[PDB]
Design a protein around this motif. Structure first.
Motif, PDB file in Angstrom:
ATOM      1  N   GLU A 241       0.804  -1.220   0.000  1.00  0.00           N
ATOM      2  CA  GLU A 241       0.000   0.000   0.000  1.00  0.00           C
ATOM      3  C   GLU A 241       0.842   1.277   0.000  1.00  0.00           C
ATOM      4  OE1 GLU A 241      -3.358  -2.517   0.010  1.00  0.00           O
ATOM      5  OE2 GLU A 241      -3.385  -0.344  -0.235  1.00  0.00           O
TER       6      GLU A 241
ATOM      7  N   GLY B 193       0.827   8.085   0.841  1.00  0.00           N
ATOM      8  CA  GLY B 193       0.440   6.721   0.542  1.00  0.00           C
ATOM      9  C   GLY B 193       0.761   6.290  -0.875  1.00  0.00           C
TER      10      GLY B 193
ATOM     11  N   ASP C  29      -0.516   4.156  -5.967  1.00  0.00           N
ATOM     12  CA  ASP C  29      -1.204   4.123  -4.672  1.00  0.00           C
ATOM     13  C   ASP C  29      -1.089   2.734  -4.035  1.00  0.00           C
ATOM     14  OD1 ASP C  29      -2.916   4.690  -2.507  1.00  0.00           O
ATOM     15  OD2 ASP C  29      -4.724   4.537  -3.725  1.00  0.00           O
TER      16      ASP C  29
HETATM   17 CA   LIG Z   1      -1.499   3.771  -0.769  1.00  0.00          CA
END
Ligand SMILES: [Ca+2]
Length: 242
Positions: free
Chosen positions: A10, A54, A233
């Motif tokens: 992630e 992120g 992402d």
């Molecule tokens: Ca992410």
């Protein structure tokens, strides 16, 4: 259960962090990539780092000496899925000569040479086609210019580089189906490779990169605005009943 998330990166972390070395390798150098590409891939955080929001950011740059640097990251020897929905959410870069990709090579590479080890290109874009992406497989008897390829255009005449989109293959024994933003645009099965060997029923590793220059994308010109960022992402593998 189908739809369960089996594995992901992630890209969590503070701005300026390196990608996780337990997952990713950095390939390096400006030689051997084929296709008459220009870039020198590096392991520098100038070309790959997390943004604190992120995302992994891979940055293609022009250096003071006129060279181009970028990153090419792989999961070889670290994560090698076999089947699943393999999906990344990516905001691709833009501009003439820029060539971002999310793709896979067979785990038996290079002991089994390309293309016998197989290649699955989940998303490729070339800068002169801001509204299009391509998905392809390369295998023995169907590789290079004979790769089995499909194209998806848009949305609504828009550029993919404007925001994040999802790019996936739903990969099962004997079949691969490509999806952009959950929409099918290409499919290949054991039946569509003719009398050639099907080489996709084995583990593959994942690759993210941004090339600069190449026979397909062509080369930077006076309109190319560097640096360019590819923002990722996540990379995820979902259970698909395989
Ligand atoms: Ca992410």
């Amino acid at each position: 259960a189908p739809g369960d998330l089996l594995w992901s990166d992630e890209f969590d972390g503070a701005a300026g962090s390196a990608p996780n070395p337990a997952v990713w390798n950095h390939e390096t150098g400006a030689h051997g990539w084929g296709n008459a590409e220009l870039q020198n891939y590096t392991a520098s955080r100038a070309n790959s780092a997390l943004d604190g929001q992120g995302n992994l950011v891979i940055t293609a740059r022009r250096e003071g000496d006129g060279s181009y640097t970028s990153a090419r990251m792989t999961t070889q020897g670290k994560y090698q899925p076999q089947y699943g929905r393999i999906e990344a959410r990516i905001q691709i870069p833009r501009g003439q000569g820029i060539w971002p990709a999310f793709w896979m090579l067979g785990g038996s590479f290079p002991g089994t040479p390309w293309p016998s080890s197989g290649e699955i290109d989940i998303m490729e874009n070339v800068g002169f086609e801001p509204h299009r992406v391509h998905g392809t497989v390369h295998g023995p008897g169907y590789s290079g210019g004979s790769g089995i390829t499909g194209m998806y255009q848009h949305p609504q005449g828009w550029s993919f580089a404007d925001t994040f989109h999802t790019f996936a293959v739903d990969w099962k024994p004997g079949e691969i189906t490509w999806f952009v933003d959950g929409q099918q645009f290409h499919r290949v099965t054991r039946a569509s490779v003719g009398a050639n060997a099907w080489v996709f029923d084995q583990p593959f590793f994942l690759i993210l990169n941004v090339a600069v220059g190449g026979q397909w994308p062509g080369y930077p010109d006076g309109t190319t605005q560097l640096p360019q960022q590819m923002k990722v992402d996540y990379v995820r593998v979902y259970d698909n009943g395989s």
